[PDB]
Ligand binder design. Structure first.
Ligand SMILES: [Mg+2]
Ligand SMILES: [Zn+2]
Lengths: 135, 209, 135, 129, 36
RNA sequence: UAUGUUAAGUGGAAAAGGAUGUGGGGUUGCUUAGACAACCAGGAUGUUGGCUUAGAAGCAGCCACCAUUGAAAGAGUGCGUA
């Protein structure tokens, strides 16, 4: 699973996800891509599952791109611990995706199997998506 | 199991896992085997075992060893290239007794006999086999071993199928090993071997010489 | 007359009580004389190879032995000199036949085939020639 | 439409020239008959050059509109297979009657022998002679 | 009959209709009958 | 008061997902030289194409998938016979 090799600080703020995507709002590498319509956090587990289900249908033919990466980390507390006494220990890694950001790319396959592969990927992500193509 | 399936199964695309990691297969899979003489049986694989397995987990595998619990022929694949093979074999028997598999015809099959230098495989002594499961001779050898063990009531009996009545020529080709067939003016003459169920199912068609 | 006229192609000349000469007329009381000797009598000079014979049976047992022509299936074997047909078709050719050899076979069967144009009728042999794979 | 009309227009005039060139034009109702049954008559007529054809009803009447036909207005109905006979008018006329006795499905009534549209009653005399 | 919120055709002979104000699939194969 | 929408008591509770509910715009094929739907008729010949099979004739499986009568008919779209 995609994790950073090392980080400067182990703890980070939750942040916010308001506004349009700063960059990457268009397809540049492949010819089809999944575009987010809403905004939500995407963990690294959902990136992996949406990728195996995406290359398995393509039978390992053609190249896919991952346009997002889980830079930020989040923490959690055990059950039975009261509030306070510091901060929790990190658990996973997330990538806050604002609306209008392409998350995947497809090239090297015909029209029929490009849309179907993207369709199976979208069902594993918690955001409402749309299949978009280049020009 | 993969070698046997590739050898005989119609759906040869249907394969099984195969890797060197501990506990590669954790779920049982059933496959249907069709020997060339039109004989049918099933072949199942199970998860493996290790020494001093916790007793909590054997209670859970009591379910996963149901297929071997109610079986007809067992094969106890013992490695023959690891010096502690005697210990591993015996451990297998104690684990099986814990599950509740007993009074079962066991056929031992020592594998990996290619690695051992200057050994005669395939062979057979008592109920013990020496073979490597990567060649087209050991596999077929074990197939006629299973043929000897399972099917031993397939007595031969001639038949005279009425010429008009079809659907019996076809049945006595996919459920028997037809030795010879003949054509007469009053029907067709069939000589083959069938299960004792068929001796009473189709008793009238037989004709005595 | 002729209650049933199920066509029964069989091994003409050396006919035997085989399924090709069996259940085809086995519902109409086919006799060995009316199945083997009847074809043997008709195929005096047509014996040796297998040629079709269409028969008709009335309410009373009637042997209407009408042997068909030496079809292009047997003809394609002698012209191409292949005992076993080449199933490879376009993948490969087991053998080949002379271009003039096909004309002799086509000319012989020309009266049987209902094609006004002899040149067109020779083109139909190419499909039979391509059917066996070997030219 | 332009592709459709051009093909339709060209084919329509072909019948009119053929009808003008034909010394006797006939048709029979090809309904309830074997595919090869007509072929038996067609093959015999093929050696005599009396082959026929069938087209759409609207196109069939288009040629007759401008081919000097004044009695074929009511003949553009049902399964129409116009037969052109410019070489042997008597032979094609008796060809139809030969199959009509053998097969009752062929009640040929169209007749343009000598360019004149004889009625279905007078066609039978033409068919039998 | 399969009662699920995701009724959709499975084969080429399936058909989608509406009876009593709900979506259902009727097919010649009885295993394909679904209702929402 | 004027112009429209809803048939769900939605109005007056709640998502991913599913759908020939309904109204409004756009892009288009075919058609009175006759469009879709129905009814009538046809729907064939070499030929049971080759290989494999006890058995493979369009329809167990793989290979090219022709010419012929004709305006149409596929070396056959689904049933069925071992
Ligand atoms: Mg395993
Ligand atoms: Zn269905």
């Amino acid at each position: 699973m995609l994790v950073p090799k090392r980080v400067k600080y182990r703890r980070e703020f939750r942040g916010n996800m308001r506004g349009r995507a700063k960059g990457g709002t268009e397809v540049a590498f492949g010819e089809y891509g999944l575009q987010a319509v809403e905004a939500s956090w995407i963990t690294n587990r959902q990136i992996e599952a949406a990728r195996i289900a995406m290359t398995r249908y393509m039978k390992r033919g053609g190249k896919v791109w991952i346009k997002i990466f889980p830079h930020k980390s989040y923490t959690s507390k055990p059950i039975g611990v009261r509030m306070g006494k510091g901060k929790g220990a990190p658990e996973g890694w997330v990538s806050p995706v604002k609306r209008g950001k392409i998350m995947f790319e497809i090239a090297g396959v015909p029209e029929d199997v490009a849309r179907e592969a993207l369709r199976l990927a979208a069902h594993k992500l918690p955001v409402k998506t749309k299949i978009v193509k280049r020009e | 199991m993969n070698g046997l399936v590739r050898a005989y199964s119609e759906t040869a695309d249907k394969q099984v896992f195969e890797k060197d990691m501990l506990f590669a297969t954790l779920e049982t899979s059933v496959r249907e085997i069709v020997l060339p003489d039109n004989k049918q049986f099933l072949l199942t694989d199970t998860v493996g075992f290790v020494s001093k397995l916790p007793h909590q987990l054997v209670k859970a595998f009591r379910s996963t060893l149901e297929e071997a619990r109610d079986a007809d022929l067992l094969i106890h694949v013992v490695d023959y290239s690891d010096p502690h093979y005697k210990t591993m074999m015996k451990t297998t028997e104690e684990t099986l007794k814990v599950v509740g598999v007993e009074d079962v015809p066991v056929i031992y099959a020592y594998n990996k006999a290619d690695l051992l230098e200057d050994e005669m495989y395939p062979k057979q002594t008592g109920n013990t086999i020496i073979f490597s499961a990567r060649e087209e001779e050991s596999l077929e050898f074990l197939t006629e071993v299973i043929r000897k063990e399972l099917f031993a009531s397939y007595e031969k009996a001639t038949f005279l199928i009425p010429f008009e009545a079809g659907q019996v020529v076809a049945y006595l080709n996919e459920h028997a090993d037809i030795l010879e067939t003949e054509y007469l003016e009053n029907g067709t003459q069939i000589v083959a071997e069938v299960s004792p169920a068929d001796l009473q199912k189709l008793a009238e068609y037989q004709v005595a010489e | 007359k002729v209650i049933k006229e199920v066509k029964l192609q069989i091994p003409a000349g050396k006919a035997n009580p085989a399924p090709p000469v069996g259940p085809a007329l086995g519902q109409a009381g086919v006799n060995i004389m009316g199945f083997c000797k009847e074809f043997n009598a008709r195929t005096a000079d047509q014996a040796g190879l297998i040629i079709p014979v269409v028969i008709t049976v009335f309410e009373d047992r009637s042997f209407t032995f009408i042997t068909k022509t030496p079809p292009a299936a047997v003809l394609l074997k002698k012209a191409a000199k292949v005992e076993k047909g080449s199933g490879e078709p376009n993948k490969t050719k087991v053998a080949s036949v002379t271009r003039a050899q096909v004309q002799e076979i086509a000319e012989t069967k020309m009266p049987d085939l209902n094609a006004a144009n002899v040149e067109s009728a020779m083109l139909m042999v190419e499909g039979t020639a391509r059917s066996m794979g070997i030219t | 439409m332009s592709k459709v009309l051009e093909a339709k227009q060209s084919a329509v005039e072909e019948i009119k020239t053929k009808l003008s060139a034909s010394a006797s034009t006939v048709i029979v109702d090809y309904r309830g008959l074997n595919v090869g049954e007509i072929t038996d008559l067609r093959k015999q007529l093929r050696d005599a050059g009396i082959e026929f054809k069938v087209y759409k009803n609207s196109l069939t009447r288009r040629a007759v509109e401008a081919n000097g036909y004044e009695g074929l207005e009511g003949a553009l109905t049902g399964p129409n297979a116009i037969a052109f006979s410019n070489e042997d008018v008597v032979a094609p006329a008796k060809i139809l009657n030969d199959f009509a006795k053998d097969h009752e499905a062929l009640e040929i009534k169209a007749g343009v022998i000598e360019g004149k549209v004889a009625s279905l009653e007078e066609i039978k005399a033409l068919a039998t002679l | 009959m399969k009662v699920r919120p995701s009724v959709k055709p499975m084969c080429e002979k399936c058909k989608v209709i509406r009876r009593k104000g709900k979506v259902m699939v009727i097919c010649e194969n009885p295993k394909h009958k679904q209702k929402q």
